[PDB]
Design a protein around this nucleic acid. Structure first.
Length: 118
RNA sequence: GCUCGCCGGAAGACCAAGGGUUCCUGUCCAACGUUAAUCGGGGCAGGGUGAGUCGACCCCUAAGGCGAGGCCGAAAGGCG
């Protein structure tokens, strides 16, 4: 579910907002670390036999902010080729209002493609 | 993995002495291994030795060691 909300500041400029669902983002926090919990070389443990308590209490949630950048542009496969609003390549990437286990709201800024004299 | 061979009062399993991480897991192959090595009792990194009742310490003494005073000896020191 996308729920695109688009407002225009003035003319050529444009702001696009992405609202990913509340329970859909942080349900794969487990699904993004079980492919790296079996790869981390913590001192006192074997190769990939680290219990869930130690890895989660150190950076088990501190790597989701790097996946939050991947989920910042994950919805653009359902926003650029399915909703057809064309930005100017790579716009700004500004994080916005995020709550505790809840919805994600932010906005970008660019200019639209001007017309051509064909 | 399947055959073949060898020891079986030992070439098996433990303990004391002595050694002091050689134990286990991941990784590396320059040097070390009488050859090559991906392997090792090798290099590097992390783990691993849980005791009222097993041993030490402890109580008691043998050979013997030391020995308050003491006797003896130029000094050191000897015997007790």
């Amino acid at each position: 579910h996308m729920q695109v909300s688009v407002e225009t500041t003035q003319g050529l400029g444009r702001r696009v907002t992405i609202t990913i669902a509340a329970d859909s983002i942080e349900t794969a926090v487990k699904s993004e670390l079980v492919n790296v919990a079996k790869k981390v070389r913590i001192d006192g443990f074997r190769k990939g036999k680290v219990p869930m308590n130690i890895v989660a209490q150190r950076y088990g949630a501190s790597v989701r902010q790097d996946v939050l950048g991947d989920l910042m542009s994950r919805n653009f496969i359902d926003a650029i080729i399915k909703e057809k609003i064309n930005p100017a390549g790579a716009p700004t990437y500004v994080p916005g209002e995020y709550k505790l286990g809840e919805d994600f709201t932010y906005s970008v800024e660019f200019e639209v493609y001007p017309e051509v004299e064909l």
